[PDB]
Amino acid sequence: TLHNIITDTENVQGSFSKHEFQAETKKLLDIVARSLYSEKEVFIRELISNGSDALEKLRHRMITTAPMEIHLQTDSVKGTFTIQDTGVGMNKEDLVSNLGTIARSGSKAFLDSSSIIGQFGVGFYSAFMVADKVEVYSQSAEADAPGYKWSSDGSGVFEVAEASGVRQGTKIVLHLKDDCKEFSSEDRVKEVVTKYSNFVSFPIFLNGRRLNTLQALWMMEPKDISEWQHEEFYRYVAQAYDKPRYTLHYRADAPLNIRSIFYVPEMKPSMFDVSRSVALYSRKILIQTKATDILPKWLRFLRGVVDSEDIPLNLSAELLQESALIRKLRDVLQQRVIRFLLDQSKKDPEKYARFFEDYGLFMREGIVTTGEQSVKEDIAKLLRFESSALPAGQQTSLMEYSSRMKAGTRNIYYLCAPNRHLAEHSPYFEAMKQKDMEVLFCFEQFDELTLLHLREFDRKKLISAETDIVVDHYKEEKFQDSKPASERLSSEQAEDLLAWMRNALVQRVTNIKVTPRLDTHPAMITVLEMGAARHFLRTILQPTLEINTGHDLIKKLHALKDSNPELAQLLLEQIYDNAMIAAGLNEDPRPMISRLNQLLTRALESGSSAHIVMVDAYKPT
Amino acid sequence: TLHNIITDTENVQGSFSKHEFQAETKKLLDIVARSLYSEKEVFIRELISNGSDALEKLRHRMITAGGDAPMEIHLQTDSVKGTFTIQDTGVGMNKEDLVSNLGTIARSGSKAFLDALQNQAEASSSIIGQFGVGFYSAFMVADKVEVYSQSAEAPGYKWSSDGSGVFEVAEASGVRQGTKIVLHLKDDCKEFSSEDRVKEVVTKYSNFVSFPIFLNGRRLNTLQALWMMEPKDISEWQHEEFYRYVAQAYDKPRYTLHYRADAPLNIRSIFYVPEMKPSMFDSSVALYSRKILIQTKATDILPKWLRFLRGVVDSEDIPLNLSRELLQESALIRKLRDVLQQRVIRFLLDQSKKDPEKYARFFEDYGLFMREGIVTTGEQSVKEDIAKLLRFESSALPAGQQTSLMEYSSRMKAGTRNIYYLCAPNRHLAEHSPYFEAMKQKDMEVLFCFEQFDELTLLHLREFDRKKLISAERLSSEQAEDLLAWMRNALVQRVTNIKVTPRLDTHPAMITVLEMGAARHFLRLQPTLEINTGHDLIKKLHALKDSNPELAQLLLEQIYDNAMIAAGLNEDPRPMISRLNQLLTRALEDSATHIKFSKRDEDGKELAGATMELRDSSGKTISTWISDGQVKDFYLYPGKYTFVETAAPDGYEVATAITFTVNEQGQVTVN
Ligand SMILES: Nc1ncnc2c1ncn2[C@@H]1O[C@H](COP(=O)(O)OP(=O)(O)O)[C@@H](O)[C@H]1O
Ligand SMILES: Nc1ncnc2c1ncn2[C@@H]1O[C@H](COP(=O)(O)OP(=O)(O)O)[C@@H](O)[C@H]1O
Ligand code: BEF
Ligand code: BEF
Ligand SMILES: [Mg+2]
Ligand SMILES: [Mg+2]
């Protein structure tokens, strides 16, 4: 039944020889040049990072005055990229051991400055991605040493000679290959600096002009950032022209080190873009997330930045193609954002209402597409509704509903209608008012779908009014009519009428019934799973028609079936249609307009009238 | 104002030494085992790739120096000891090859083997390894690695290391032909001694590896790489099954494209379009190379608008990043994306011919993707490529029938080069557009674009076929004028115009709109109601406005609402139902009493030309008019009034004023 081959069979014979690992240097160089970094442009990042590190080491040495800066120069005529830093520079032994040895990083021995970027000992070789020839001039700041020129074609060997006129620091000259002339373009080189190296701690000059490098706001003390600095920084990170309506500046080292700023734009989101967002950093250097989480999909409306020292970097930079503790970070961020937004609702409900109006669709999306019930409920805390127990216009929440529920109660009742007036005057609400439960009023298009997917909240089942009305037939229909029996059809009249209606609506309705639960309305359509039926139509519903035998229209229909039978049927058809529309279960309303106009004319029938008459006498002469 | 210190101030002084690049072996091992891959689980991919390569070399040897051995990769987990073991029955390694290949970073025996083959040999395209580092991925997850290997030539060996710069080699007995690798897993990596976990990783990366893969004596990879087979030797049921696997889906593909080509690059690929339409409540095309997963969500190979496709793309010669989970930046990959874009467009176009019906359903479901593509791309040539897939309706065609921009370009009058469209919520609002009524009479055909984002699509399209798209953008004569003047006051802030028109027939009124752009924002407004003065409800409305003003208010409101519905401008009439019910009950049951006034001669025939006033008991003139040879209607409320003749026509005597009373019961008396 099983096919295995692996067995404990092997035994060592005699002694072992010991060996050291070695390297195929030529092929390592090729790997760094062609196979290590997925984008050619990052040689700029790597060289700037090296210059920044050389400057940090000098700064640190300076404590134990001169300028500390990084210069870039593009010669589009000579096809040349030059970078020069005023840092510690390198001696002969340093040029040989650090530059000449792959995976050797002098920026490690440096152990006494979380400012140091360099780690791997390969970044420098990225120059050979874009250059036939690389020359290095370095002057190890120190009374002893002289200058040096380091030189290589990138294959196999390199040569070093003593040099004069070498300024303190290091200059590196890239003779660009014809493939890569784009990096002798000033506009091109500028694009790259501001992409990866825009938060570097020393000034960078490009062809004599100082680049507008920035402060890493996310690393700084939240209380020291003014609203205006956030406005500006938002515009930078979101590449936007408006300002944030909310700003969340979150630091933690709790489960994981986190330094982050999130913004909600003041603009409403584009509906085009919704169907068609935060940057990830470490050590002030950009790190890529294409095809990665950081935030869950429903929080893609947020803009801003996340930095976490617990995220390891691969040898290139990207990495972000993971699920480890990213999934954790994402869960932490989601929780914190929900808490932030709940707090904004407390502070300023009216402002939150505007937020919810503009961004609520993201919450609904999040509830609908999550499989995790606890997450659905967390996000659900952000939803807002009106209530039958609160004045019109006043927003409430599932939490506040829960806190008004009497000790006995175990369900949350809701009603979805286009607006406050229609909900308040809904036949489904009239029926519910005979009970003493609070009803949530939900006015937005996908609120019902949302609550259907939510299903329950804090162990309380969500039930639509329409559903609850149906369920009550299968319990005690112990409800009394709104009007005394004198204002209703007698039983004999009700039965006679119903039997007529059943014949007139044979294959349109499952059954027809009187209900004591209506007041203003002549009838209503009921369906057990009303919400799901409404949802299905967005592309027969064993519907029940329930009539109010106290309503003027119903009573008139009773008469009409024996006086103008054809008019009675037209009326009946219209009452059903009106109940289907009120139920939200109506197909195209256009084909009913014909009947309605016809009905309207036949209903509306002048009379006879009283005449006052004046005679004009003729004059004589 | 500039600051530069870069100057040619250096000079080469004296002689120079030549030095060879070196390599810090210790640190480099750490880099592979720590800082190379996004996930630790990837050591399983690498070791299986190596077993596949070993097997492939053995298979190649036996073509020529034939012999008889089964070709298999075996994995074993031990959850008590915390070990992961992989064994292949491939070509194995002698002592020299263990020291050379395993002991030297970036040395690849498999690469050398590849370089010596005829490019035509099958092993040329199935050997995976290139870099000579994949093996060091074991130290990511293992404190100790043991390799037992027995070459196919004329002694077994055990290679052993902790991964800290040294390794040991000793002779070993009992080693089976091939190679066995035993990982003693780190404490934080013990999950790879779990069978279920290892199974997840094997199926993720290595499910299509050419050789049988066993785990704890059970076979895993039962899935053959359909994209490498001849399109003709694959059945519809194989596609359905493969689709479901590769898309993780449960429906069938509505469309299947099996594309092979050796052109800009080796391509073996299969694309599917799902049968199920997508929505809000919510995999991609995967990238492979030599049957191994590179990216579950391929990024650079397709344009974003084709993200609705599922399936797989495999290329043997696509340039891989060292991590094997990315592609290098490449002009070849750019060309590939362009080629695929064109192939899929070509395929969908062909499908619109073979079955326009089916393609019509496809365009309804996925058309938004095409519209997005046209808006987001910057190449005019490609915009017009994707635009060949668009369907609209036309002014020159019946309702509900689709046409392409090409078919429009077909029918155009010989002396013209302009594409006229009109983006409307619906057909009614289109056919009755002022701007379109222009193009009806003198000019000719207009595209009707009802779908959302149809507008900015064409705006972004700009130009198609070297041509330019441009948006083309009873009751008497005084009874009616009276009615109109009343209507403008009850609907003061609902419409910006009220007209009278002779169409309608069955319809008492219709809504028309000038700007379609507005109407969208409205259901995203300045309507124009137009009245049929021959319609019974309108003539009823006319009569009730004075007689039963409150009833005529409901009726008016209803006629307006009914017209907005008939124009598709109000899709959810819930706001009107309570009112409509009031209208019905009141219609089936006025306060003002109808009073008809006759001015006559001595024979009792109606007399024109008399100036008349009606005044109330206070003396106030309520109304002044001239008799015109027919009866005059008034509607008065309870009180006392007087009809006064203020001028008689020439040759007639002025009659005595007539005083009358209307009471609360609607009965009238002359006093
Ligand atoms: N501009 C510079 N000035 C001084 N030292 C430098 C400079 N650039 C590189 N180095 C030295 O060379 C080493 C190698 O650089 P690189 O290959 O990028 O590795 P790292 O990851 O250490 O930065 C560094 O560790 C540093 O000691
Ligand atoms: N299971 C095996 N059987 C025989 N040879 C192997 C096996 N695994 C690895 N090798 C040899 O070791 C070399 C190093 O493997 P690896 O570091 O993955 O580099 P590569 O990219 O060449 O596969 C291979 O080129 C191959 O010659
Ligand atoms: F700049 Be080093 F390679 F991290
Ligand atoms: F498996 Be090798 F490093 F490509
Ligand atoms: Mg560096
Ligand atoms: Mg390998």
Numbering used by the authors:
A (entry chain B): 85 to 148, 153 to 200, 209 to 372, 377 to 639, 652 to 717, 722 to 737
B (entry chain A): 85 to 152, 154 to 239, 242 to 369, 376 to 566, 588 to 638, 653 to 717, 722 to 803
Sentences from the paper on this structure:
To generate an ADP-state in only one protomer, we make use of the observation that the MD-Arg (R402 in hTRAP1), the only residue in Hsp90 that contacts the γ-phosphate, acts as an ATP sensor and mutating this residue would effectively mimic the ADP state. To address this concern, we crystallized an equivalent heterodimeric construct of zTRAP1 (+/R417A in zebrafish sequence numbering) in the presence of ADP-BeF. Heterodimeric (+/R417A) zTRAP1 was incubated with 10 mM ADP-BeF/MgCl2 for 1 hr at 30˚C to allow dimer closure. As predicted from the DEER results, the heterodimer adopts an essentially identical asymmetric closed state, and the C-terminal-fused SpyCatcher-SpyTag complex packs against its symmetry mate in the opposing dimer. The structure shows that the R417A mutation does not perturb the overall closed state. To avoid model bias, the dataset was refined starting with alanines replacing arginines at positions 417 on both protomers. The Fo-Fc difference map (insets) show strong positive density for the arginine only on the buckled protomer (ATP state), while the R417A mutation is on the straight protomer (ADP state). This is completely consistent with the interprobe distances measured in the DEER experiments correctly representing the buckled and straight protomer conformations. Altogether, this demonstrates that the loss of the γ-phosphate contact within the closed dimer is a strong determinant of the corresponding protomer conformation. The construct used for heterodimeric zebrafish TRAP1 crystallography (+/R417A) has modified linker lengths appended to its C-terminus to account for the offset in starting amino acid residues between SpyCatcher and SpyTag.
